[PDB]
Design an enzyme around this catalytic site. Structure first.
Site, PDB file in Angstrom:
ATOM      1  N   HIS B  14       1.077  -1.246  -0.184  1.00 15.42           N
ATOM      2  CA  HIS B  14       0.141   0.077   0.046  1.00 15.42           C
ATOM      3  C   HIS B  14       0.902   1.410   0.120  1.00 15.42           C
ATOM      4  CE1 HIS B  14      -2.597   3.306   1.306  1.00 15.42           C
ATOM      5  NE2 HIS B  14      -3.688   2.567   0.968  1.00 15.42           N
ATOM      6  N   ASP B  16       1.063   4.106   1.121  1.00 16.77           N
ATOM      7  CA  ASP B  16       1.378   4.966   2.529  1.00 16.77           C
ATOM      8  C   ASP B  16       2.369   3.978   3.323  1.00 16.77           C
ATOM      9  OD1 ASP B  16      -0.131   7.266   2.371  1.00 16.77           O
ATOM     10  OD2 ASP B  16      -2.084   6.153   3.027  1.00 16.77           O
ATOM     11  N   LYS B  17       1.974   2.732   3.171  1.00 14.38           N
ATOM     12  CA  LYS B  17       2.742   1.727   4.014  1.00 14.38           C
ATOM     13  C   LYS B  17       4.299   1.553   3.588  1.00 14.38           C
ATOM     14  CE  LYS B  17       1.265   0.594   8.140  1.00 14.38           C
ATOM     15  NZ  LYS B  17       2.750   1.163   8.390  1.00 14.38           N
ATOM     16  N   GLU B  42      10.928  11.510   6.377  1.00 10.13           N
ATOM     17  CA  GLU B  42       9.567  11.385   5.867  1.00 10.13           C
ATOM     18  C   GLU B  42       9.830  11.078   4.501  1.00 10.13           C
ATOM     19  OE1 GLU B  42       7.354  11.923   7.904  1.00 10.13           O
ATOM     20  OE2 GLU B  42       7.667  13.520   9.221  1.00 10.13           O
ATOM     21  N   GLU B  55      15.018  15.503   8.294  1.00 12.41           N
ATOM     22  CA  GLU B  55      16.237  15.782   9.023  1.00 12.41           C
ATOM     23  C   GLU B  55      16.954  14.759   9.855  1.00 12.41           C
ATOM     24  OE1 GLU B  55      16.162  19.304  11.735  1.00 12.41           O
ATOM     25  OE2 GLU B  55      17.942  18.593  12.832  1.00 12.41           O
ATOM     26  N   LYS B 163      -5.603  -4.337   0.956  1.00 18.05           N
ATOM     27  CA  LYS B 163      -6.037  -3.962   2.075  1.00 18.05           C
ATOM     28  C   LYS B 163      -7.343  -5.247   2.637  1.00 18.05           C
ATOM     29  CE  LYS B 163      -6.763   0.819   1.199  1.00 18.05           C
ATOM     30  NZ  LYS B 163      -7.888   1.871   1.562  1.00 18.05           N
ATOM     31  N   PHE B 232      -8.590  -5.255  -9.711  1.00 19.46           N
ATOM     32  CA  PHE B 232      -7.468  -4.314  -9.020  1.00 19.46           C
ATOM     33  C   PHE B 232      -6.399  -4.820  -9.864  1.00 19.46           C
ATOM     34  CE2 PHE B 232      -6.038  -3.183  -4.417  1.00 19.46           C
ATOM     35  CZ  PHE B 232      -5.298  -2.094  -5.008  1.00 19.46           C
ATOM     36  N   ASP B 240      -2.282   5.844  -6.359  1.00 19.20           N
ATOM     37  CA  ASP B 240      -2.527   6.636  -5.118  1.00 19.20           C
ATOM     38  C   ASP B 240      -1.385   7.066  -4.476  1.00 19.20           C
ATOM     39  OD1 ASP B 240      -4.301   7.745  -2.942  1.00 19.20           O
ATOM     40  OD2 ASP B 240      -4.322   5.915  -1.965  1.00 19.20           O
ATOM     41  N   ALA B 241      -1.293   8.345  -4.270  1.00 19.92           N
ATOM     42  CA  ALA B 241      -0.040   9.147  -3.440  1.00 19.92           C
ATOM     43  C   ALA B 241       0.013   8.362  -2.052  1.00 19.92           C
ATOM     44  CB  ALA B 241      -0.389  10.620  -3.168  1.00 19.92           C
ATOM     45  N   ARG B 246       0.439   7.886   7.615  1.00 20.91           N
ATOM     46  CA  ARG B 246      -0.855   8.072   7.175  1.00 20.91           C
ATOM     47  C   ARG B 246      -1.558   6.578   7.266  1.00 20.91           C
ATOM     48  NH1 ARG B 246      -2.112  12.571   3.596  1.00 20.91           N
ATOM     49  NH2 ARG B 246      -3.763  11.245   3.247  1.00 20.91           N
ATOM     50  N   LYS B 247      -1.192   5.842   8.096  1.00 19.24           N
ATOM     51  CA  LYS B 247      -1.849   4.528   8.413  1.00 19.24           C
ATOM     52  C   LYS B 247      -1.566   4.347   9.845  1.00 19.24           C
ATOM     53  CE  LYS B 247      -3.705   3.284   4.621  1.00 19.24           C
ATOM     54  NZ  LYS B 247      -3.770   4.806   4.499  1.00 19.24           N
ATOM     55  N   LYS B 267      11.393   7.808  12.604  1.00 18.75           N
ATOM     56  CA  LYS B 267      11.622   8.748  13.807  1.00 18.75           C
ATOM     57  C   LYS B 267      12.433   7.686  14.699  1.00 18.75           C
ATOM     58  CE  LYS B 267       7.369  11.150  14.026  1.00 18.75           C
ATOM     59  NZ  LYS B 267       6.115  11.756  14.649  1.00 18.75           N
ATOM     60  N   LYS B 271      12.162  10.660  19.657  1.00 27.43           N
ATOM     61  CA  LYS B 271      10.831  11.005  19.576  1.00 27.43           C
ATOM     62  C   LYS B 271       9.696  10.374  20.094  1.00 27.43           C
ATOM     63  CE  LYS B 271      12.865  13.148  15.889  1.00 27.43           C
ATOM     64  NZ  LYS B 271      14.342  13.089  15.864  1.00 27.43           N
ATOM     65  N   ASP B 273       6.729  10.539  20.399  1.00 27.47           N
ATOM     66  CA  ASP B 273       5.453  10.073  19.660  1.00 27.47           C
ATOM     67  C   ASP B 273       5.525   8.494  19.473  1.00 27.47           C
ATOM     68  OD1 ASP B 273       4.119  12.447  19.093  1.00 27.47           O
ATOM     69  OD2 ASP B 273       5.236  12.597  17.124  1.00 27.47           O
TER      70      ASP B 273
HETATM   71 MG   LIG Z   1       3.429  15.249  16.847  1.00 30.14          MG
HETATM   72 MG   LIG Z   2      -7.874   5.420   4.449  1.00 25.87          MG
HETATM   73 MG   LIG Z   3      -3.510   7.324   1.527  1.00 25.95          MG
HETATM   74 MG   LIG Z   4       4.742  16.517  12.085  1.00 21.79          MG
END
Ligand SMILES: [Mg+2]
Ligand SMILES: [Mg+2]
Ligand SMILES: [Mg+2]
Ligand SMILES: [Mg+2]
Lengths: 379, 380
Positions: B14, B16-17, B42, B55, B163, B232, B240-241, B246-247, B267, B271, B273
């Protein structure tokens, strides 16, 4: 039994939120010429550049580069020292663009799978969690003073920053009752020629005290303002940004739940946005109608399928006498329609209303054009 | 009484993955050479390109383009017709590099940012994860394993995107979730043009669904949907970008529990997060595994530059064992666990190059020995 809970918000100039706003400025520019437009517009940024990328099907004739520059300008990024300059940055545009059975609006399938949640709580008049309201109020007021206040008073503010608010709660029968504000943290970007000591006075008097209720603040409330040191270096130069990296700020601040989908850059056929908006309206209508004090709604879809694969309602034990979550689901199914063609028409989602949603939170909003915030009386 | 709930997962291809895995493959490549590396990497993608931005402060000497190509290759994007080709795609690297401070011991090191992070655990499954997420993840994981390891005559038709989404019907009693049946299974699977959906549907049901979903939760009413909307073939970045982060729901609890908002991939461990959510998982999992409750949510939140968390919260949804409540559990947590980032990072061994494996298949409920946030502690 008390507890602490925290939520955050970020300023419109935070690099991730800048990307959400560009994504939605582009969406709106398309819709204002062509309401039927399909848009999946992602934005990313770092030192000296913005890229917009994804897929658009439209009849609009939009100068994307110009929409990107004007958005950045309105936000205040007009010098490399602030972290980006709309005049000098590079703008990279990488946007791209079979028999089907005839379909009525009822028949139109979801464009993807996924689930979306809606949430409401009678803690505040916005029917939102107090933590999220307060954090969001802080960043929104900073942004308004910066973008509307006189230079002699606020000309030192730069676009980036964040806030995080911790509330101490009591819970009585699943109902959340805020007891006090425990901690307020604010990070705010600033010109080199003002010091943090000054900043703290200003933020406390003109922002914190203006948006936080005084009966919730006491001499023990911890106020932290740029505690780590000065914050002159910020924006894209300090941190990359991408669309859809602030999904919890855009929604409930950690309360409730999230299905994972971003909102910005997506037209209404993206159920990640439209389904969440409908689910908010349902949760909000249930609480507004007095049938409970707090409500979580989940809807789930499959690609190509009009009716949702599932629907869920939870009221956390707060349902009014004579109601339960079984009965409330039955009531929701009599009143609300989650088939995407219907929902998009009911919520007027082909209108160019989205740029305003891309900072400040999508929920708890007073704007007349947000129909998902105008609750229905249910019984 | 009864209710329906859904969770989803996506395949490693996928878009994003794919971006998450590139981000973490670059993180690991830095850590292999330099455990003190700072990384905020990123990744984004669309037709014909990958861009890496952000960075990194490191002594490592990493060939970033090569790491990106080899990652994409391993995932199986080796053709433009599949949505991406590692051989021909553009790789664009836009990574950047970066003041008296009082001397600081490990206890003193501040969080690198503000934010909140949640951990969750539930006794529904042996992984101490929600069944809906286990099942959806098990489907995508098995698809990926067959594609990347199965014989081409059997599986050569699979492409990298896809998916799944699983809807379980539950009973809830006093906060405890008991799965009753699997209500709906949806699978979207990318494929070569020379197989038709009818063959796909048989293969998936028999070799994936029935392999990973318990037969006693399936019945003749369970709704099985495989590529319901049509073929598919066109997928991946072309269709799809993709972007890192995003997951985040796929990465964590599938809609259960809660999320603070921060992504994990790309990260390093300073971090919060990432490292805070990992510690918060360990807490929740240790509370459940200890039999102190059936389900547990934990929130921690931080302020940039400050070592101790600004807040900690525990909710056991009314499922606490006799003699325990959330007040007393928080006291127990505060005796045993330490959320100061310098301590956390050392206790979880987070300077080790273990992260690429986390970037598909979910970060939680994982059995791998190197994931110390999955090894619970006995509490009382
Ligand atoms: Mg944050
Ligand atoms: Mg979605
Ligand atoms: Mg997406
Ligand atoms: Mg950010």
């Amino acid at each position: 039994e008390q507890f602490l809970f925290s939520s955050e918000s970020v300023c419109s100039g935070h690099p991730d939120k800048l990307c959400d706003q560009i994504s939605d400025a582009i969406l709106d520019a398309c819709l204002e010429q062509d309401p039927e437009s399909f848009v999946a517009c992602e934005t990313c940024t770092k030192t000296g550049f913005i890229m917009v990328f994804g897929e658009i099907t439209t009849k609009a004739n939009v100068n994307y580069e110009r929409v990107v520059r004007e958005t950045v300008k309105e936000i205040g990024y007009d010098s490399e020292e602030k972290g980006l300059d709309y005049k000098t940055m590079d703008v990279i545009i990488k946007l791209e663009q079979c028999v089907h059975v005839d379909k009525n609006v009822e028949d139109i399938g979801a464009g993807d799978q996924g689930m979306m949640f809606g949430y409401a709580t009678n803690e505040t008049k916005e029917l939102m969690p107090l933590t999220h309201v307060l954090a969001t109020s802080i960043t929104r007021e900073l942004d308004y003073i910066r973008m509307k206040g006189v230079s002699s008073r606020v000309g030192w503010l730069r676009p980036d920053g964040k806030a995080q608010v911790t509330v101490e709660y009591n819970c009585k029968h699943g109902v959340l009752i805020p007891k006090r504000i425990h901690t307020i943290l604010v990070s705010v970007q600033h010109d080199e020629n003002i010091e943090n000591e000054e900043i703290r006075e200003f933020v406390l008097e003109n922002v914190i005290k203006k948006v936080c209720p005084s009966d919730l603040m006491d001499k023990e409330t911890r106020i932290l303002i740029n505690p780590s040191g000065r914050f002159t270096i910020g924006g894209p130069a300090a941190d990359a940004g991408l669309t859809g990296r602030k999904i919890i700020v855009d929604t409930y601040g950690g309360w409730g739940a999230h299905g994972g989908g971003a909102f910005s850059g997506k037209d209404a056929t993206k159920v990640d946005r439209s389904g969440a908006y409908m689910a908010r309206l349902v949760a909000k209508s249930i609480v507004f109608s007095g049938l409970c004090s707090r409500c979580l709604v989940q809807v789930s879809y499959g690609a190509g399928i009009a009716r949702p694969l599932s629907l869920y309602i939870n009221t956390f034990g707060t349902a009014k006498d004579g109601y339960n979550d079984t009965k409330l689901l039955e009531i929701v199914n009599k009143v609300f329609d989650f088939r995407p063609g219907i929902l998009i028409k009911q919520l007027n989602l082909k209108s160019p209303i989205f740029k305003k949603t891309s900072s400040g939170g999508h929920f708890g909003r007073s704007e007349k054009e947000f129909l998902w915030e105008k609750p229905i009386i249910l019984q």
